[PDB]
């Protein structure tokens, strides 16, 4: 009875190439991972410095700087973060499948309420996609400066620093590919930062310090690169629901969705228990234009994890009848993918679907009392409610209350079916409805002309989806629907 | 500034914590990877027979079998593939990022016809989405039968198997989670096999327990029956395009879908060279009535990279306006993502899209031979053609003359702009076609999107 047991191994030589060319679709990944790492270092400084402001040595300010070099191709990434030590560069940055989060929580094992993103420890290797050679200038507030460099792809180098010191922070020096030199463009850096690291939580100054060349002499021409409040955007999303202002998160959503106007409704809440998360869920003021292009990339719900952008494929996060929601969920326990792009535990995905649709319908109920807003919401996204009515059976009744329709005395204002419930007559044992293209054509139709003689009211609901749904609601409010095809020319009696 | 160099360092603990929870989208993908691997082994032995049929004596019918068991909560998958060598076992299943498929594909180049699906070596690890304990048995044509037993908990144990005699191939025994027993259903297995492996290239037999009369007191019959109801769609794009007849036509269309109706168009082709991909295209005789029902994912073209379904997302592989053509694309050189769910090298996808657009023009001209058939074509799927007119600019001028039109004057005969251009009228100033939701010689445009069509077709070839 031979028994052989072997530990799990890894063929690394294939593995770095696998990660670089298969884990991450775009070369844009070179920047988001390192910027999030700088954010984590800055939060580390904050947590270690509010306990002892003595560690706030030299420059008290915390920031991130991007310093490209068109002449050289060197991509210098200066930050004022925690820096690196020997142990850091060896284990947290220089080892695959290991991150500084594990060691940091192993040091602070009690009350370490820090939701930092540096958990995977493999996003650092995503730099190869733009840079052939990568270098790191890092200096702790306590440890000396050290140089981490790698270009071989199979071996990396570390040398002691003796020249220009940093004091506080890390200066990541890359070398953007000569063919990929478009990444050296300041505009390209700004755009990739906005799309990947928009809400980091610190001013990424982007302040390229000019390589001054003294002295016929030339005047100053590259006076300053754009240090706009786009990369350098400060954190204002950190406010809880108590001090959140409407216009601030309106501008936050404008930035997130590249929009110009605010959002028509806000919903911030913290669902706890087995699943804990905050959810900055809003609604677009206007419908997305992908109604015709149903196969368009639907990037409406931009889920975040620890203030880091993760999700764009909103199709699997929510049932398609609530895929028009634009907002951010900022969780702290959601199991992501290795590429930080899509959510894997699909039982948890279904749980999230149920909770989010419940919250969205509850908000719509809060949006119900104010008539104009809910009328606008009906005009913009009432169709998804119809589809959920048509095939999502569990929340049909909940959706049904949300439904608004036009009736006889209602004129041309869509009122609830519960308004019809509010005005049935005792003789009526089944609710009168009718389907058609227009209200008036069926209003004068003989189907309800026998009904019109008494001044009765009949539901007038008119769309092809309205024609198909009537099959699914067999009976509403405990009473069957009245139609010349549902019941014929039959006269019920008491 | 002294210099120090690193060695290999990859934390095993977080590795498959990420693999189990941060690799694959849906839990049911576990069987798709298993069937893909079994079919890759089957294609390996098919190539081996093509160069040496003698060794195929260990089994003739290249098929796969599925045995659900709600009683034991176990999933059994037995195939007749190339099997496993213990060294291959360790180096590929027991070692991440090592694929025998990639090595075999790069070992030989003359046999470009063969399909080697899979490139990394981690798809087998998707089995831990639902299986608490995974037990994989296999017997290579050369190596003995060694089973694979591990729970992805930092180690794996293998030894010689002495259980059920695997005559030839692999054998995957699963012990799925108790809360996921819904995946042991016969109907669910049918659904996922038809969605993922209906054109796998080999028989898939799904055995089921059948009713027996119980004492009956006279003759108690057998217990079970074996249903090869799956993959009734035999692989025809592998075969030549000449030997396709209306009976194979109808069988392929009716088993590819579940529709009782029949095809309207066939376009079988295979483009080889720098971009090797085959494709079989089949068009319904009617526009589907569930077109406005998004609960049916818009997955008309199932990209079967190397005869295995990879993912039916039509965001890059085929444009939106080709959402009506339900068919199979058999590529051979695609750079799959780590989970076999998305793709990275988008230039290959773009050139494949353009090639498929040209092939769809060829299909339109193929139906252009039969005026009545092409008339039914256009009056059924006019929406997709006009959507393509709006969307694609590369072939915007090419698609114009391939269109048929029922007009206020042509009656029940569909008129073509190609013929209409051939009799171009000098007095004519604009092409006669007016946007509408539904219905000189003036064409009624069947789509509301046709306002964008008149935006696009301002003039075609001087019209
Ligand atoms: N400012 C920083 N710059 C670079 N690396 C940092 C910084 N702060 C911390 N690190 C370390 O970088 C190593 C991690 O890598 P990667 O760049 O792989 O990040 P992650 O852990 O994968 O997540 P993210 O990329 O979101 O930070 C971690 O182990 C973390 O300790
Ligand atoms: N049933 C099988 N038949 C034949 N070979 C198999 C089987 N299962 C695993 N293998 C081999 O072991 C290696 C395992 O693959 P896995 O299925 O683990 O990844 P892949 O097939 O390499 O690609 P991917 O990661 O995209 O699925 C495969 O590459 C294949 O060579
Ligand atoms: Mg990082
Ligand atoms: Mg595989």
Author numbering:
A (entry chain B): 10 to 224, 267 to 545
B (entry chain A): 10 to 224, 267 to 490, 507 to 530
Task: Please give the exact wording used by the authors of the publication that reports this structure.
RAF kinases are integral to the RAS-MAPK signaling pathway, and proper RAF1 folding relies on its interaction with the chaperone HSP90 and the cochaperone CDC37. The stability, subcellular localization, activity, and MAPK signaling of RAF1 depend on its interaction with molecular chaperone HSP903. HSP90 employs ATP hydrolysis to aid the folding and maturation of diverse client proteins within a multi-chaperone complex involving the kinase-specific co-chaperone CDC37. HSP90 and its homologs function as dimers, wherein each protomer has three structural domains. CDC37 facilitates client protein recruitment to HSP90 by interacting with the client and HSP90 to aid their association.
During 3D particle classification, we observed a substantial population of HSP90 in a more open conformation, lacking RAF1 and CDC37. To characterize this population, we solved structures of HSP90 in which the CTDs are unresolvable, dimerization occurs by the NTDs bound to ATP (ADP + molybdate), and in which most of the MD is resolved and participates in dimerization. We refer to these NTD-MD HSP90 dimers as a “semi-open state”. A semi-open state map was reconstructed at 3.5 Å. The semi-open state structure revealed HSP90 dimers, with only the NTD and MD visible in both protomers. Unlike the closed state structure, RAF1 and CDC37 are unresolvable in this map. Similarly, the semi-open state map revealed HSP90 dimers formed by NTDs bound to ADP-molybdate. In the semi-open state, the src-loop of each HSP90 protomer is directed toward the center of the dimer interface, contributing to dimer interface interactions. This conformational shift of the src-loop in the semi-open state prevents the formation of the luminal cavity observed in the closed state. Similarly, in the semi-open state, F15 and F17 (HSP90-B) interact with F165 (HSP90-A), forming two of the strongest stabilizing vdW interactions (−3.29 kcal/mol and −3.14 kcal/mol, respectively) in the HSP90 NTD, where the β-strand swap occurs.
